[PDB]
């Protein structure tokens, strides 16, 4: 299952 | 930094003339990921070569497998041509049946 924040 | 590809050209199975096999060109340890890889039969680019999905190792360096079905013969010479920004000219690596 793939994972469900910017720099 | 940029990293130059480590290139390996080999068959899936030890080669036997007349026996169907797969010709592989594995490039690894490179960066950036932009790269062009061709398999050559007697100097001529082989059509319809497939390759793996772009992935990378723990150190972030990329690896790809290029491959095509083929049947080795005594006469036919095979090689892999790798075109990458770290190479002043494409590296052409000949298939050696024991490498």
């Amino acid at each position: 299952f793939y994972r469900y924040a910017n720099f | 930094i940029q990293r130059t590809p480590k290139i390996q050209v080999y068959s899936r199975h030890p080669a036997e003339n007349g026996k169907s096999n797969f010709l592989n060109c594995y490039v690894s340890g490179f960066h950036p990921s932009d790269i062009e890889v061709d398999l050559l039969k007697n100097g001529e680019r082989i059509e319809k070569v497939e390759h793996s999905d772009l992935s990378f190792s723990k150190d972030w360096s990329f690896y790809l497998l290029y491959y095509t079905e083929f049947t080795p013969t005594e006469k036919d010479e095979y090689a892999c041509r790798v075109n990458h920004v770290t190479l002043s000219q494409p590296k052409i690596v000949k298939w050696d049946r024991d490498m």
Binding site: F1, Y2, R3, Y4, A5, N6, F7 | I1, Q2, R3, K6, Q8, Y10, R12, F22, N24, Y26, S28, G29, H31, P32, S33, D34, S52, D53, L54, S55, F56, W60, S61, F62, L65, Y67, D98, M99
Partner: protein, 274 residues
């Protein structure tokens, strides 16, 4: 033994030639099972292993949603990195991301990963405690401060210890015949004179899975590190792996050299001697 699930993503910007290309792949141990390519026609997460094809239409819908969202996030992140590093909008840059988890033989959570690299070098990573970040440079420290304040780690912690683990255990069961196998290496040696006074010995390991393996040459029982040529372990294409190690030896002295092969599929390490 233990197992891992990893997703690897690569975003590459291409000024002028449109938006960044995003490619993601998923693995369980050394077996790939999904892919997504932003340049492809489907715009879908796609199966790349037989044991995942059985997943229903909802799986493929959800995975596609999740990976497309990542794709947009890293597109934004590339632009921010340009700013942080004061780089021209003309250059091509790379943002890589890796995440996933390890479990023990009993399926228990062992460790989680969530890390980024910019232009091929560490940018920021979640530490093992899953509560803190390691930033590689001043640019990443900006991100670290933001993610600490926004408690970004707590979420990742969750997925890593929950969804990630469940998925791996599920895949390990569904792909049991493929994933819980070990294929021992088939070994042999080759030998080629290179001159009147030297010859090559090459020690081969073929058809093995998983990819982890150790090949070592000894002479009269002493490891020969620095003179061995060792190639990177490579895929055969059929789901198994290959490796060789070679040494150049004085002609007539071949018998002094032994190749030692270690792999989890071998009850006892093998020793080969010409």
């Amino acid at each position: 033994g233990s197992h891992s699930m990893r997703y690897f993503s690569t975003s590459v910007s291409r000024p002028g030639r449109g938006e960044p290309r995003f490619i993601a792949v998923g693995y369980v141990d050394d077996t790939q099972f999904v892919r997504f390519d932003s340049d492809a026609a489907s715009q879908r997460m796609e199966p790349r292993a037989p044991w995942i094809e059985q997943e229903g239409p909802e799986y493929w819908d959800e995975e596609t949603g999740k990976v497309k969202a990542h794709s947009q996030t890293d597109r934004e992140n590339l632009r921010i990195a340009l700013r942080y590093y004061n780089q021209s909008e003309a250059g091509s840059h790379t943002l890589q991301m890796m995440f996933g988890c390890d479990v023990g033989s009993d399926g228990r959570f062992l460790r989680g990963y969530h890390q980024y690299a910019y232009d091929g070098k560490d940018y920021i990573a979640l530490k093992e405690d899953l509560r803190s970040w390691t930033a590689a440079d001043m640019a990443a420290q900006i991100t670290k401060r933001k993610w600490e304040a926004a408690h970004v780690a707590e979420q990742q912690r969750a997925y890593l210890e929950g969804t990630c683990v469940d998925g791996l255990r599920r895949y390990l069961e569904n792909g049991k015949e493929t994933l819980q196998r070990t294929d021992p290496p088939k070994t042999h040696m080759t030998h080629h004179p290179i001159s009147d006074h030297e010859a090559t010995l090459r020690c081969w390991a073929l058809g093995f899975y998983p990819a982890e393996i150790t090949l070592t040459w000894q002479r009269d029982g002493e490891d020969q590190t620095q003179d061995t040529e060792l190639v990177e372990t490579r895929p055969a294409g059929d789901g198994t792996f290959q490796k060789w190690a070679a040494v150049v030896v004085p002609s007539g002295e071949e018998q002094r050299y032994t190749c030692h092969v270690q792999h989890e599929g071998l009850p006892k390490p093998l020793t080969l001697r010409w």
